Amino acid sequence: THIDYKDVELLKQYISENGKIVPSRITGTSTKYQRQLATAIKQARYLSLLPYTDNH
Amino acid sequence: MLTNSDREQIIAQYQRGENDTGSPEVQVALLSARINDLQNHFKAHKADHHSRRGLIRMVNTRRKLLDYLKGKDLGRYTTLISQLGL
């Protein structure tokens, strides 16, 4: 429906245990919402609500 | 850029009939305002070639419209370029 970078709990299940964005061929999401997912995840990473990688 | 308010100001000043917004005069006046407004942007970003392409396109369209007016009503073309200073 809609997506934001503050939805950390929602963004946790689209990011892998190593911190990588899970691809659309796996999650099944549409291209538009995958694009919004990616930009929100990068913004959350900058805000340090999510990790870039699992070894900082 | 131009806003809706000043775009409607230009349209109301160069109205040919009631709420026409499609005559050569109103089109050329809107193009002239937009070009004069974008000159400021291009004085700042002169390496902007992609936006300058669109600016050149609106210059070409304004020239075509002015040629069409010159062929259509000569006095109308002369008066319009007299207001717009072209």
Partner: protein
């Protein structure tokens, strides 16, 4: 133009965060600015250590203002030295409901 700005302040300097915030609220409201939302998320465990610290104080506030006041706020965030991070975003609407994080 509406702006959603999130501030990351040092945990040691969290005692002055209220004055920190009200300074920017007063600056915005002075110049015909509207504070459409303001919340303090509190101390939060950072996903990665910023500047050799592992917790930080998060403060979000969505406002509406002009370019000149935005530049003033940006310079204030940059030279505050207590705000260890900032994120300024441009929003089309005005956001008022409480965020899911608070």
């Amino acid at each position: 133009r509406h702006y959603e700005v999130v501030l990351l302040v040092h945990p040691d300097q969290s005692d002055q965060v209220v004055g920190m915030v009200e300074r920017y609220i007063k600056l915005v409201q002075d110049n015909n600015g509207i504070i459409h939302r303001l919340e303090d998320w509190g101390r939060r465990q950072l996903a990665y250590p910023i500047n050799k610290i592992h917790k930080a104080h998060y403060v979000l506030f969505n406002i509406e203002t002009n370019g000149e006041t935005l530049a003033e706020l940006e310079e204030l965030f940059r030279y505050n030295d207590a705000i260890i991070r900032s994120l300024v975003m441009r929003r089309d609407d005005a956001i008022t409901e409480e965020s899911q994080l608070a």
